[PDB]
Design a protein around this ligand. Sequence first.
Ligand SMILES: O=C(O)C(=O)CC(=O)c1c(F)cccc1F
Ligand SMILES: [Mg+2]
Ligand SMILES: [Mg+2]
Ligand SMILES: [Mg+2]
Length: 716
Amino acid sequence: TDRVSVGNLRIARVLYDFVNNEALPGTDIDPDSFWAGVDKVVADLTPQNQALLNARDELQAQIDKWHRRRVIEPIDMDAYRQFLTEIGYLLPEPDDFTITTSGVDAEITTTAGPQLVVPVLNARFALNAANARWGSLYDALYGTDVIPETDGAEKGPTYNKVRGDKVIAYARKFLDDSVPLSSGSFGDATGFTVQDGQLVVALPDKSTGLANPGQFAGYTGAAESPTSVLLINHGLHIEILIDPESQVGTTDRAGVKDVILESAITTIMDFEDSVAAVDAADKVLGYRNWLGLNKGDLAAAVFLRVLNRDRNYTAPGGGQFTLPGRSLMFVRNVGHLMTNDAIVDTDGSEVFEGIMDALFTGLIAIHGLKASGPLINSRTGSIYIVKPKMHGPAEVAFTCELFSRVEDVLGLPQNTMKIGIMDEERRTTVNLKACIKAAADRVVFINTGFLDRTGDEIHTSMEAGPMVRKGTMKSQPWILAYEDHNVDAGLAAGFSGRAQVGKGMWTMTELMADMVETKIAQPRAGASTAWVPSPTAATLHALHYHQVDVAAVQQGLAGKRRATIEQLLTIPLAKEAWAPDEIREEVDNNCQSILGYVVRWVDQGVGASKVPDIHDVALMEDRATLRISSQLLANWLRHGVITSADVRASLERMAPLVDRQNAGDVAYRPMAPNFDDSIAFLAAQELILSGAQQPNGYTEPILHRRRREFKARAAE
Ligand SMILES: O=C(O)C(=O)CC(=O)c1c(F)cccc1F
Ligand SMILES: [Mg+2]
Ligand SMILES: [Mg+2]
Ligand SMILES: [Mg+2]
């Protein structure tokens, strides 16, 4: 009695009102025509959506039976691959082709740099992420472990000048490495001037210019005493702020106050694995934040926080130009699996959620194409949607047809809605060229979502035998081939200069020294973007793109074929391998990370949490990391590595530790000692004990059911 009838649909009133009162005004779309289009698109495309999900089940059943029907020691790769071809899992590779996607912004086609992912249901996080286009290097260095807290350089309640001077020195070296002087070092600079459109750096006994004056991009203030100096390197901007009257500037030999880095070039506003949204009320919260971002007027509490305006500069010659102040925004829709009762049909059947996301996030994104102040997002006229968890090229073609039909409902030009393709399921990996071809006129990135991909690896081969420990997965042959294969397919499809080639998330949110040391591997592998968990991590990962010329790396990689199908298909089976203490560590680690994530998901609707692991390393958890942990334990239980008593005792042992870590939140409900009274604890148990039975190992069916159950209990 809380719904609105439109054709065969029954729409939750909160969603109907949100769309009519907030999303539609200003788009010139007729409300009656919009809702008729929703009815028609749902009716027309739901059968194919269901057909595709049934096809996954039929293929996995055949693969399950194949492994159970054999006894031979190692996979006979020739027989295995021929079988995958017969059942239509491995499809033929199409001829070479070049993508044709047009109307894409420079941040995607050309600029190499970090890409930030943030939960769209958290307005203050989403605001900080959009504002992360520019970030302080001094803050990122001083506040993290990139500068070690050795004797004398420790962080305290007040500024430590010994630490501050290490920060300054680190940044001066970065400047020398990125925008080198004709002679001397930035460490010895005493001042900056702009004379006849050229930057002049004062040294103690002479003056000098840049080795490449073309890296001088502009300044603020008067040319003869600028307030800042703007530089560019590998397409990314660097700004030296000059203020001798500041706390840090007073100590600096040139009065430098900070070094600002262009950081999160693009940001993915996430409706998928980092949020918990199980009904119309939840979906409206997310849609309204996405609306505020595109209209430019989102403002969050704690005083209030707003979106940054663009940045004004004087060109080296003399004109006034402007640089984007905000990250270019993508939105990650949900994939093809789930339904959501935000809309039900006349029989009470829930509507597919990915279909709804395309309609509603596409509608809302129109506001980002028009004046807010200037328009917020795409100046070239595109809407950028990340589509996750697709399995193979028919599922990509379906997304493209869904987008085409939504463009018609919205009165948008065909191919306005672009697609960032996650390569995060095995049947996409091994058919990647065909997947890109299916979206050849819409694709704006491919990205190795390696954590979902690991979950799919385990589930697909669940019946083959026990898998290696999850920490071993990152170095197994299949995943190394998968990473190279993805780059190869992108470059061969003409992505250089046209679309992003992306790699995955750094999850250790406090291990920033390790990130700076290690994550450089991604641009060295030819990735023009990769995922960071925070604005601070975006600023630090920006350093890697100044050190690595990704454009040159991609040109050197052109034409290579560095992964075979046999390599891609190498299942991560454990050899005949573990002492009891290693098995116990794996179980306790997986149970602790499952419980820490799931308890905040089910009881508080939080879809991404920092959860310390068994080694007290803080990890950003979302559904993909949960998918790995629950599938690994399900696999170990399936093949006798551990018993059902092992699992239960581990969960009961780790649950009170998770309770302790959450003891300060008035909204937290402890799981122990009354485990069977905690919907959250039972959800975590169900994710393991029923994991082998979930479709492709997905965690949403259980999580959504258990969160809805919790909401009902809290309302009675
Ligand atoms: O690798 C994949 O499948 C992803 O898609 C990555 C992802 O959501 C994510 C994650 F796993 C941990 C933290 C933050 C995130 F955004
Ligand atoms: Mg994923
Ligand atoms: Mg260079
Ligand atoms: Mg199954």
